[PDB]
Every structure is written in structure tokens, then in C-alpha cells.
Design a protein around this ligand. Structure first.
Ligand code: MET
Ligand SMILES: [Mg+2]
Lengths: 90, 252, 111, 365
RNA sequence: GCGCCGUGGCGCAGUGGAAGCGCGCAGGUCUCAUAAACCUGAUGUCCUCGGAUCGAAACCGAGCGGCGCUACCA
């Protein structure tokens, strides 16, 4: 048995200019990370960067203010659920 | 006033690994207090503070915080310390940290006694920490040895036995985990297990019930390594004593 | 200061005040929350009525008043067309709150 | 040791477990955020004021230590539309029951019915209906419900199945319930001489039905553990316990004693003659409706190569239909069934994701 | 009940004197402006309560919550 709802944290990270960054915390480690990053890069105008945390956690970077759009994209391309998302900041 | 150096001799040696608590930044670097050797002031000249150019000074070094360091220039006459942070090799760092920790622990030991009775601190230092160091190298090692088997305290006498007793108490029952997984599914299996436990627990510790097949006992340790010898005995009992019952038991 | 100080902002002068009178509804003109701020002067803005619409910036505010996401806005709907509509007046946050309190706009969206 | 096995069937949250708590005191532990999930268990002593629950008459009238009539046991089922498969299972141990309807909710509620007809189907004919939550209703409401009840209890087999309204929350009127259950749920004779046979529904546990076990007998469990085959497990009765008190022997009525593995297994005399079938001959009948859910859609006749839950004894097994005649179908099973006698069974189908009781019959060898 | 996390906010780690890292919010500084880049934070002593010992969040207990073991213990 596996938990259906895990806390995925889409945070506000301050990027160059008045612009921001979609940073994802608490990523499910089941699918290939690099592949997902590549997919994300392809779909938007973003660059994918992964910051590694020991034992559990990987910070996934996507340059820009999308949030909802990103979530929609994730929903469209299988690998991540609908309920797992949380917007953090404002 | 409380003072006196961490090690045996008054003055630091060349290429000695230290840990430095940052006081204030000036021009050369910082007038730091060396926490591996007394509290004598020295400096890290702006060239050997970091391996690479890091621009920021108050994030990689930080005022109030400790830094892994090495002593470069020493002048055995009055008191100067030319110091480095860069010359400390990869790894090595861990060792230095450990040493620092040991030193801190040693320091912690030597103040309670003073508090209890005043009397000159230098004398106290002489009669507790130095002879052992001279014999071996570091006081923490000596302490460890004592803990393992009490013989280093017999060498040089403490001011009173009370202090020694207190130290012993501080050092001291230590809980060691012992898990038993009995392969039983029968109705009268639990009872059998209990019976087995009662023949092994007696004559010397704290048995906790988690499940019918799983039983978790905590064994007491008086001198830290005394708990391993009891565990071994218990294990032996499982293989030798529990044979008349015919209950299959497994150890994790 | 307006946005970013600049050498090239002192040749403008803005006059409206924070303590300005709030504008009410008209005929062929109603209130919208902004769905998503689009490009090239276009903007996707869901009306408080119950129609999706496509909103468009018409002059005036094109450089003077900058806008963001999820804002209460006066939209004069096209009388001849319907799908394309135009933004007339941006409402302040305080202003929006006051409107909400009044109950002039339907209570469905948050500031 | 307890004489008899009384079941407490009924819809969900009508308070079945709560009524068990006003009668015995015992809770089923709970499940603590949900509700009863395993069959709950509890016992009690019934004495009577000639001149009760504890050897004490000085509660009403006066002192003369009430005379002990018997010690009974209950089986708290759950109530949830889906725990159907266990409650079925549980009935196999019952010697009678008590239908807890809720006084403040629409009388024939899905599970209430599902249960009721299960009862009239398996054979549990010694029934007492009970109107529970009357402590939260209008003195009119509880009588009109008594009407709908007195009217349901008509065409059906339920002549004078009395209906004793209670308050399981404030333990009110329970003593007239004890008088009902002291009249109508009589304690069946059981020839001991018979083959020692018993059903299992927990293990960390089960009920005897025919025969009697004694401390230190040699015993086996069927079908037992599997390999794919299924072999019997032998052991010696290390001990016998009812409630918290130990006994040297054990006889029908009551429950006796890892996770609950040998669930749906049975225990008999070592060196005894019982079939461990893989394929079985059921004779059978259907309901005309699917009484249970919260919709009454009419029962489709059995098509072969269909998967159906065969509830036999305490066990709950799944199986596929190889033969479809008038009232004799032949079934192929995943997990073997030890058929101790001739027997009763209960047959279900996955109607809309959740399984549903649809018909019954008799095992045949 | 056991084990770790017990915060100065989240998320990561370390045990006997030294306010531990990454992010976030709150605020500053630098630049005409924002971001990066920088510092300072907030319940003052790192679960609740007190003690042995000057002390400490760390040593010890009674008392709570999340999961790593249990399976409902008549
Ligand atoms: C649910 S097991 C049967 C009841 C028994 N008195 C115990 O408790
Ligand atoms: Mg001007």
C-alpha cells in the first residue's frame, strides 16, 4: 500500500527582475527525474535544475511564474497526481 | 579568574590543528581564540582563509562561530600565532572536529570540581589532566581508557574521591536493545515464551511485550561494555537452555 | 517613485491620488476578475456575470497603470460583438474590498 | 464457560456495539475513528430476582442473591454495507440474534434488510428485534416505527418476534431485553458424543459447534497452510480460555481461544475424516431482489464462468461457476473448503464494485 | 509504549559548554529600480516540567505529538 496524497510544495523563489521561480519540494521518487526535467524544458521556456537533499527530498527548479499552468501540464503528462499540489508564498 | 591551557605545555607547536571561535574582524584577518590551545590571541592573514575566492566573509567564516584551523607561525618568547584555515586538508577536517569536541568535553569536566571547591586552577589541572597526557597524548583518550577499565585515575590522585565518584556517575544504567523473534503460532506458545524469559531474566533486564512472536527486552549496562556480555549470555541461553520446550526462536 | 525610479520617469507626472472616488457600474459595462494576463494588450478575464470573455486593454492604462493577476476590473462589453471586450478602469485593492462589502458585485471571488 | 452465541445484526451506526456495552459493559475496543471492524467480543452472567447482571438483587425489591440462569456470549458484527462478508461468516457461530434498528432513521435501511434476510436464510430463527435510539425521538415516532416493523414482521417468517425499544446510550429498559433474551433465545442442547468440530474467526480464536475439546488433546487445522495445495496443521491444545478465565475443557456456545491468518479455518480431532475440497456441488436458490444496498434491482440468474463469493462456515472463499443447472451448480475454488458434514452456505456477487448477498443453498457430498 | 524529528517558521542534520545548514516569510543594505548577491531575525536559551551537576536544548525522569515494531491482547 502507498499514500495517495503527498505534500508537493510549489514555492515562490525570487528570480531575475520582478520575475519568479517555480521551485518544487517533496518530489515523488518513482519516475526518472532527468526525463521529467527535459519534458518540462520542452513544454515551457524553463530550465530544469535539481538540488539534492540527503535521505529524502529533491528541490526541482523551473524558472518563471506559472504555478497553475505547471500543475495543469503535470496533470496532462502522467507521473504526478491532482491532489498532491500546494502553492507556497502569496 | 579561570584560565590555563588545554594541553600539557604552555605554548602551541608548529602545524598544530586547532578550532577557532571568531571574535572580531580587523585588517590582517581576525583576532581569534584558539579552542584547542588556551585562549591566546592569533590571526589568519588574508590569503589562507579559504581555498577559493568566495567574496563574502560573514557566511563562510562568521563572527561568533568556530572554524577548522591549523597553526603556521609560533614564537616561543611572548605570544604570537600566525594561523591558517586553508592548509587544513580534505578529511582531516573531521579529525580536527573530533579533537575539538574532545577538548570541549575535557574542559567541561575540569570546571565542576573547581566550582565545588575553589583552590588554584593550575594545581587542579596538574593533578587531573597532564600526567595522563604525558603518558599517552590526549586527555580524552585517557578518560576513555578509564571508562573502559578504571586504572588511569589510580595513577595520579584527584583532590577528593567524591569528585571521582561524581565523574563515574556522569559516565554511567545504559539501555541496550535485545529483540527476540519466536516462530510460534500456537495458543500455548506465548506462555512458553514467557516461561523461557523468566528463566533467563533472573540472576544478574527490562522485558517489553510488543507481539506474540516479537519480544523486545532492554539490557542494562553498568560500565558500558558490561551489557554486551549479558546479551551474549542471553543468546546462549536461547540456544542451550531452551531445548526442552522445543520452541523455535530467532534473533535479529 | 512609480515603478523603478529611473532617469526616464520624471517626464510624465501622475495625478489621481490614493484617496480617489470609486467608480460604479454602467449599461454595457460590468465587473471582471482577471483569469490570466495575456500578451500584446490582450487579457483573459472572467466576468462576475457568468461569461468567460476575452478582455483587451484599450489605451489610457496601457502604460500609466500596471496590472496583475486576479484583479477586479471595469469592462465595457462590446455592444455589437460579444467575445472580445475592453477594459476601462482598474480597481484598487481597498476599492475592491469596499465594493465587496457593499455587495454591488456578486460574492464569488477573493482579492 | 458461556452457554450460547447471540448475534447482534443490523445497519451501520444504529449502535450495535453500544447496546452490547449497556448489556455487558464491554466495548469491542474499536476502528477508533471508524467503528467496529473485527467481530467484537464480550460475555455476561444472567441471574434473576426470584424475590439481573451481577449476583445482586438488592438493586430491586431486595437482597436474596439472584439465582444464576446461565452465562451468555455475544458477537458484535459491524454494520457497514461492505463488512457483509464477515458478518455472514460470523453468523456461523450464532445460536440466535438481536436486530438493532435505529429509532431515528428510515426503517428498512439497506443493511438492516440485508442482514434480516441473511438470518432467515441461514437458519437463525430465534430473533429479537430492538428499537434503539428512542432516547432521541418523539413519543409518536417510536410507535409508528413499531408499526412499520410490526408490518414488515408479517408475511415474513417473523410471527411474534417481539420488539423491545431500548436506549443503548443511557442503558434504559435493558432489563426487559434481558427478559426477552431469557425467554426467546433458549440455549440449544448439543450432543457432545459427536465429532469434535469448531470454526475459527480470529487468532492472535473461534467457536465450537459440535463435540467438546479438552486440555492436552491432539488436533488439526483445515485446510491448513498452502504450498498450489493445502495441508492440515497439527499441534497440541496448549490451553483453553473463555473470556479472561481459564478452563480445562470447552463446549458449544461461546467463543474460545499472527494477524488472523487461519481465518476461516476449522479445527477438529487429529486423525479425523474431513474433505478438503477444491470443487463443490451446491444445491441452491435465489432471492428475487437484491435486498441490502441503500436500489432493489432484480437478481439475474447465474451465468457460468462467473466469479462469486462462496461464504462457507466461518470461511470466506472466492470461486468460479463450471456448471449451471436449476438448483445444482458446480464450483471451482481458489482456497479449499474443508467440508465437515453435509452443511449451509451463502452466495454473493460483485454487483457494483461492492459485493452483495444474492442467494443460498446446501453443500453436497 | 518503543525509536528518530522535537526550533528561531518550513525542510534537512548533530549530540556533554561554541545559537547547525538549505529554503521561506519579516525587514534592511548595495544599484536609478527589481533580482542575484548580502546581513539581521522570531517564544532567548533547540518538546512540557523540574532536578543531579555552576551550568546546557544535550544527563535523568514523570508528561505529549508524528511515523520505524506490533495487530485489536480474553
Ligand atoms: C471477541 S472474542 C469473544 C469475547 C471474549 N469475552 C473476549 O473478550
Ligand atoms: Mg515634471
Amino acid at each position: 500500500e502507498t499514500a495517495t496524497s503527498n505534500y508537493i510544495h510549489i514555492r515562490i523563489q525570487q528570480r531575475n527582475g520582478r520575475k519568479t521561480l517555480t521551485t518544487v519540494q517533496g518530489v515523488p521518487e518513482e519516475y526518472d527525474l532527468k526525463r521529467i526535467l527535459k519534458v518540462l524544458k520542452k513544454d515551457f521556456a524553463c530550465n530544469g535544475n535539481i538540488v539534492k537533499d540527503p535521505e529524502m527530498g529533491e528541490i526541482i527548479q523551473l524558472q518563471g511564474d506559472q504555478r497553475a499552468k505547471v500543475c495543469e501540464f503535470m496533470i496532462s503528462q502522467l507521473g504526478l497526481q491532482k491532489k498532491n499540489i500546494k502553492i507556497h508564498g502569496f | 579568574t579561570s584560565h590555563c591551557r588545554f594541553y600539557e605545555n604552555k605554548y602551541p607547536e608548529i602545524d598544530d590543528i586547532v578550532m577557532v571561535n571568531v571574535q572580531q574582524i580587523a585588517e590582517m584577518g581576525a583576532y581569534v581564540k584558539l579552542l584547542e590551545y588556551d585562549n591566546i590571541e592569533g590571526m589568519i592573514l588574508l590569503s589562507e582563509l579559504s581555498r577559493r575566492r568566495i567574496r563574502s566573509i560573514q557566511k563562510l567564516i562568521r563572527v561568533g562561530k568556530n572554524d577548522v584551523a591549523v597553526v603556521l607561525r609560533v614564537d616561543k618568547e611572548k605570544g604570537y600565532i600566525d594561523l591558517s584555515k586553508r592548509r587544513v586538508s580534505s578529511e582531516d577536517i573531521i579529525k580536527c572536529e573530533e579533537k575539538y569536541q574532545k577538548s570541549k568535553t575535557v574542559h567541561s569536566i575540569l570546571r565542576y570540581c573547581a566550582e565545588k571547591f575553589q583552590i588554584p586552577l593550575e594545581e587542579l589541572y596538574k593533578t587531573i589532566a597532564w600526567p595522563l597526557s604525558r603518558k599517552f597524548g590526549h586527555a580524552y583518550e585517557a578518560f576513555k581508557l578509564s571508562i573502559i577499565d578504571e586504572t588511569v585515575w589510580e595513577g595520579i590522585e584527584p583532590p577528593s574521591k567524591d569528585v571521582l565518584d561524581e565523574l563515574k556517575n556522569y559516565i554511567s544504567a545504559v539501555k541496550i536493545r535485545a529483540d527476540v523473534e519466536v516462530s510460534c503460532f500456537s495458543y500455548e506458545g506465548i506462555d512458553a515464551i514467557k516461561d523461557a524469559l523468566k528463566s533467563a531474566e533472573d540472576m544478574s533486564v527490562k522485558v517489553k511485550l510488543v507481539a506474540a512472536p516479537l519480544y523486545v527486552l532492554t539490557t542494562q549496562a553498568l560500565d558500558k561494555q558490561k551489557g554486551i556480555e549479558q546479551l551474549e549470555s542471553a543468546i546462549e541461553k536461547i540456544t542451550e537452555v531452551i531445548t526442552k520446550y522445543g520452541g523455535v526462536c530467532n534473533i535479529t | 517613485n512609480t515603478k523603478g525610479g529611473k532617469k526616464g520617469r520624471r517626464g510624465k507626472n501622475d495625478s489621481d491620488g490614493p484617496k480617489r472616488e470609486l467608480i460604479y457600474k454602467e449599461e454595457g459595462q460590468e465587473y471582471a476578475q482577471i483569469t490570466k494576463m495575456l500578451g500584446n494588450g490582450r487579457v483573459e478575464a472572467s466576468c462576475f456575470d457568468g461569461n468567460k470573455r476575452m478582455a483587451h486593454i484599450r489605451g489610457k492604462l496601457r502604460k500609466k497603470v500596471w496590472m496583475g493577476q486576479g484583479d477586479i476590473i471595469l469592462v465595457s462589453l462590446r455592444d455589437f460583438q460579444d467575445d472580445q471586450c475592453d477594459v476601462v478602469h482598474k480597481y484598487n485593492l481597498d476599492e475592491a474590498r469596499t465594493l465587496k462589502n457593499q455587495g454591488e458585485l456578486p460574492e464569488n471571488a477573493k482579492i | 464457560q458461556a452457554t450460547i452465541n447471540i448475534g447482534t445484526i443490523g445497519h451501520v451506526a444504529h449502535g450495535k456495539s453500544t447496546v452490547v456495552r449497556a448489556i455487558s459493559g464491554v466495548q469491542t475496543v474499536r476502528l477508533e475513528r471508524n467503528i467496529t471492524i473485527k467481530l467484537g467480543y464480550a460475555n455476561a452472567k444472567i441471574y434473576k430476582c426470584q424475590e439481573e447482571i451481577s449476583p445482586k438483587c438488592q438493586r430491586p425489591g431486595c437482597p436474596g442473591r439472584y439465582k444464576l440462569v446461565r452465562h451468555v456470549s455475544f458477537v458484535d458484527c459491524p454494520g457497514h454495507d461492505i463488512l457483509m462478508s464477515t458478518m455472514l461468516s460470523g453468523a456461523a457461530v450464532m445460536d440466535a440474534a438481536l436486530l438493532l434498528i435505529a429509532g431515528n432513521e428510515s426503517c428498512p435501511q439497506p443493511q438492516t434488510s440485508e442482514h434480516l434476510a441473511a438470518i432467515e436464510i441461514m437458519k437463525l430463527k430465534h430473533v429479537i428485534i430492538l428499537q434503539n435510539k428512542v432516547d432521541l425521538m418523539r413519543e409518536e415516532s417510536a410507535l409508528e416505527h413499531q408499526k412499520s416493523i410490526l408490518k414488515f414482521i408479517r408475511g415474513t417468517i417473523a410471527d411474534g418476534a417481539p420488539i423491545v425499544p431500548i436506549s443503548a446510550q443511557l442503558k434504559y429498559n435493558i432489563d426487559a431485553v434481558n427478559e426477552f433474551i431469557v425467554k426467546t433465545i433458549p440455549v440449544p442442547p448439543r450432543d457432545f458424543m459427536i465429532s469434535p468440530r469448531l470454526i475459527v474467526i480470529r487468532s492472535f480464536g473461534g467457536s465450537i459447534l459440535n463435540g467438546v475439546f479438552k486440555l492436552g488433546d491432539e488436533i488439526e487445522i483445515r485446510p491448513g497452510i498452502v504450498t498450489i495445495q493445502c495441508k492440515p496443521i497439527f499441534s497440541n491444545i496448549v490451553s483453553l480460555f473463555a473470556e479472561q478465565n481459564d478452563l480445562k475443557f470447552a463446549v458449544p456456545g461461546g467463543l474460545i481461544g499472527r494477524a488472523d491468518r487461519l481465518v476461516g479455518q476449522v479445527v477438529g480431532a487429529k486423525g479425523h475424516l474431513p474433505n478438503i475440497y477444491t470443487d463443490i456441488e451446491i444445491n441452491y436458490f435465489l432471492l428475487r431482489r437484491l435486498l441490502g444496498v441503500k436500489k432493489q434491482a432484480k437478481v439475474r440468474k447465474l451465468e457460468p464462468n462467473e466469479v462469486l463469493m462462496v461464504n462457507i462456515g466461518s470461511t470466506a472463499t472466492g470461486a468460479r461457476v463450471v456448471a449451471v443447472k436449476a438448483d445444482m451448480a458446480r464450483l471451482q475454488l481458489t482456497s479449499p473448503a474443508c467440508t465437515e458434514i453435509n452443511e449451509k452456505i451463502a452466495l454473493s456477487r460483485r454487483i457494483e464494485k461492492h459485493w452483495r448477498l444474492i442467494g443460498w443453498a446446501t453443500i453436497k457430498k
